[PDB]
Structure 1
Amino acid sequence: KFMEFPYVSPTRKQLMVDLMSTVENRLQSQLLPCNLPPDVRNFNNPNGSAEASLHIRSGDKSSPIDFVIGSWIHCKIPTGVSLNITSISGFLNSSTKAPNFVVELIQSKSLVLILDLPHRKDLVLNPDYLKEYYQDTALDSHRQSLLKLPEVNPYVSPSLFVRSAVSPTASMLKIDAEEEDKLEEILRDHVSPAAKEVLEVWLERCVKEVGEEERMELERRDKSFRRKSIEDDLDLQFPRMFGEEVSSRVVHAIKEAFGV
């Protein structure tokens, strides 16, 4: 089961369930049921070194939603330590210009947070967009509030594309606690409220209530992001984690959902 998040802490799992529940409850009427094959919703490497679940609901064509994607990945690296990734993303279609949503936690007392509403128009060409969705919404405050904590530092992605893809208000953070319980405290009292308010902004100001050429560029740009990210993050790493057989079907199903 997806919602059981069985390889992460109770605090982290609770955050992911709260988030996914909010997404599914608020967008009930505009979300289709998950149409992924059973062997793509829950899968593993034949050798047992990695395990993952995938939850994708397409949006209704008359809604602003392309799809929502939730995932957890567990990989036992040969060394003995486990990589746990938990993520929820929201993708909007070309009927709206509004930003996307992403929350991602990557953990090997150390943890990377990616929390953002990624822009879907060029911010330099379109400063009104920047004002509407980021300046008027106080999204930057979450980044700043988190950084005040001694164990929270900036995370600078090795991917220049990831750096370019996220908004100027993105919380790209590395959390380095002295113990496990300190990190857990940060998750419940700081990360959790932050992720929940960013989600609220997305639902109310982005999803909630266009130019012919504007939509054409939206799809072109949307596709460029999805295609490139899949190339960078999936094409090499999934065959490694799960084996070529399991990867081929899963990535095919992901590509189909992403429309690439």
Structure 2
Amino acid sequence: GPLGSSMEDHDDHLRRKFMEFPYVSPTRKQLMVDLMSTVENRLQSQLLPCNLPPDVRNFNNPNGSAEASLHIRSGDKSSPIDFVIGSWIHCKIPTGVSLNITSISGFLNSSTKAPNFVVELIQSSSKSLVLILDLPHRKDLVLNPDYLKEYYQDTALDSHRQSLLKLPEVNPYVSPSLFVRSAFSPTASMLKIDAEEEDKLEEILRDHVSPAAKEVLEVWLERCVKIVVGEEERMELERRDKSFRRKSIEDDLDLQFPRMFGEEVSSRVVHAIKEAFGV
């Protein structure tokens, strides 16, 4: 290009579609762009290139009802990072209620025991947007009062949830899944945001959700990603990490995907994603 090499360099271009975030608002794709850019800019020296086949990075329902994009960058041999994953999912089928999901998860390996990172924006309905924003814990918080103190007390993580909840439009979200409730830290922002007034929703996303998410990511990068872990704790951590991932993707990959993308697309991608997700 005149101003650069995005449309020339293959790596940059493989994520161009991912970063397009076609099916969401300006404010929503802007948050996600900024978040994914920080992740990759900040961790570029320890992240392997995306090796997902083009076939798995972008896929769709041939009937045009559903479209997804996935961007995964594994950590290098010496990284505390296992992998980071950006995703978006679009499904507009039934009477016309279009499901939209944008998310970024960061997952640490055994060599550290520090918290993971998660943001998810999910709009299935039209009266509601769900925000999941957390640094989920990788150690039992009652057995380890010190872990709780340095990752959740010292870090003022709960200020972000208390802040967002003050808004009249923002109620607590309660997962029907007990695993979800257990897997997320006591400072997790699990929130429902009223969605039926685009101009106000947009204002809440840009003035409130965005600073909050950027600051949470800021502590993940600064206090979690930036003593050794012994072999007994390593196996504990790996058993725990594998449950959390499996359980987090299983029903979606196995039940939701064949519906959304037809069977042919599911059969092509589902295994490859479980592969990529270590499960």
TM-score (norm 1): 0.97
What is the deviation of 1:178?
Answer: 5.1
The reply to whether residue 240 of structure 1 matches residue 247 of structure 2 is no
Q: Deviations over 1:161-186 (max 9, x none)?
A: 11111100000000015511000000
Query: For residues 177-199 of structure 1, what are the alpha-carbon distances to aligned partners after superposition, in whole Å with 9 as ceiling and x for unaligned?
Result: 55110000000000000000000
Distance 1:197 1:117 in 2: 11
Change (3 A) 1:90 1:139: same
Q: CA deviation at 1:248?
A: 2.2
Give me the whole-angstrom Cα distance separating, in 2, the residues matched to 1:81 and 1:233: 18
Asked whether 1:253 is paired with 2:269, we answer: no
Aligned-partner SS, 1:61: coil
- Following superposition, the deviation at residue 249 of structure 1 comes to 2.5
Supply the distance in 2 between the matched residues of 1:136 and 1:240 (Cα, whole angstroms). 44
SS at match of 1:173: strand
- Runs of at least 5 residues in structure 1 that lack an aligned partner in the other structure: none
Task: State the SS of the aligned residue for 1:190.
Answer: helix
Partner Cα distance (2:270, 2:196) in 1: 37
Larger mean Cα displacement after TM superposition, 166-175 or 234-243: 234-243
Residues 54 and 71 in structure 1, CA contact (< 8 A), matched pair in contact too: yes
Is the contact between residue 109 and residue 182 of structure 1 (CA under 8 Å) also seen in structure 2? no
Residue 211 of structure 1: how far off its partner (Å): 1.8
Distance 2:195 2:62 in 1: 35
Aligned alpha-carbon RMSD (Å): 1.0
| Residues 110 and 183 in structure 1, CA contact (< 8 A), matched pair in contact too | no
Task: Give SS of 1:199's match.
Answer: helix
Shift in Å, 1:23: 0.2
Q: Deviations over 1:195-240 (max 9, x none)?
A: 00000000000000x2221111000100111112222332101111
Alignment partners' CA distance in 2, 1:246 and 1:170: 34
Aligned positions, number:
259
Asked if the contact 1:32/1:60 (under 8 Å) is kept, the reply is yes
Q: Judge conservation of contact 1:119–1:167 (CA < 8 Å) in 2.
A: yes
- Give the deviation of 1:61 after TM superposition: 2.0
Q: For the residues of structure 2 that align with 1:158 and 1:259, how far apart are their CA atoms? A: 25
Displacement of 1:257 in angstroms is 1.4
TM-score by length of 2: 0.91
Cα distance in 2 between the residues matched to 1:58 and 1:249: 21
Gaps of at least 5 residues in structure 2 are 1-16
The secondary structure found in structure 1 opposite 2:206 is helix
Question: Helix, strand or coil: the match of 1:141?
Answer: helix
- Answer yes or no: is the 8 Å Cα contact 1:109–1:183 preserved in 2: no
Which region of structure 1 is more displaced relative to structure 2, 122-131 or 111-120?
Answer: 122-131
Deviates more, 1:179-188 or 1:228-237: 228-237
CA shift, 1:83, in A, is 0.7
In structure 1, the partner of 2:215 is 197
In structure 1, how many angstroms separate the alpha carbons of the residues matched to 2:160 and 2:195?
A: 19
Q: Give the match's secondary structure for 1:118.
A: coil
Contact 1:109 1:180 in 2 (8 A): no
- The 8 Å contact of residues 33 and 58 in structure 1, kept in 2 or not, is answered as yes
Measure the CA separation in 2 of the matches of 1:33 and 1:125.
37
**Structure 1 stretches of 4+ moved >6 Å:** none
